[PDB]
């Protein structure tokens, strides 16, 4: 329920709990998928970067919801995101918002990986960006009544950040990884 259903590029619903690559949509600004990446000035890669090549779909993620453990994903509904793999220096691969430079960025790891005061509590949501794309948004807890678009900060590292305006979202589509009898990690 709530709005419209979110589908992968194959036309199938995006399911909570299943693995999906998040890659740049055809109407995007180029590039591939996302993955944890090196943080400028840190030994532990806790930033999220977008691949420069559309040949690289990045690392898969799985979506979860505070209302149901399974089911189809609908736009404009609360979601939490996590990569299916995490660095050993991080306690988790969950996506979080870290604000400590005027400009909030999307990172991985929770309260055990970042100073509490730096994290911004809230939920993610997937919004439809036409019929050829989607975009991710983050809705702060305290800011009850406003969500910021997730966009790319182009600086050679294509890192994911929260945009102040809604004119520069990272346009994406969802791709299910290939499998069969088993999907080792």
From Swiss-Prot:
SUPFAM superfamilies: STI-like. One of its GO terms (molecular function) is serine-type endopeptidase inhibitor activity. The record marks 68-69 as: Reactive bond. InterPro entries: Kunitz_inhibitor_STI-like_sf (IPR011065), Prot_inh_Kunz-lg (IPR002160). Keywords: Disulfide bond, Protease inhibitor, Secreted, Serine protease inhibitor. CDD domains: beta-trefoil_STI_DrTI (cd23376). It is found in: Secreted. Its main location: secreted. GO terms for cellular component: extracellular region. SMART domains: STI. Disulfide bonds join 44-89, 139-147. Belongs to the protease inhibitor I3 (leguminous Kunitz-type inhibitor) family. Inhibits bovine trypsin and human plasma kallikrein. This is Kunitz-type serine protease inhibitor DrTI. The lineage of its organism: Eukaryota, Viridiplantae, Streptophyta, Embryophyta, Tracheophyta.
């Amino acid at each position: 329920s709530d709005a419209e259903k979110v589908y992968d590029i194959e036309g199938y619903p995006v399911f909570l709990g299943s693995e999906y690559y998040i890659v740049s949509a055809i109407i995007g600004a180029g590039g591939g998928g996302v993955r944890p990446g090196r943080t400028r000035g840190s030994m532990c890669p806790m930033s999220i970067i977008q691949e420069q090549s559309d040949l690289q779909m990045g690392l898969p993620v799985r979506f979860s919801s505070p209302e149901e453990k399974q089911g189809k994903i609908y736009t404009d509904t609360e979601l939490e995101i996590e990569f299916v793999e995490k660095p050993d220096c991080a306690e988790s691969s969950k996506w979080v918002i870290v604000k400590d430079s005027g400009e909030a960025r999307v990172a991985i790891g929770g309260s055990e990986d970042h100073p509490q005061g730096e994290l911004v509590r809230g939920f993610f949501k997937i919004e439809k960006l036409g019929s050829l794309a989607y975009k991710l948004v983050f809705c702060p807890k305290s800011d009850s009544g406003s969500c910021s678009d997730i966009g790319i900060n182009y600086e050679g590292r294509r890192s994911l950040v929260l945009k102040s305006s809604d004119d520069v979202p990272f346009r994406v589509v969802f791709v299910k990884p290939r499998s069969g009898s088993e999907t080792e990690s």
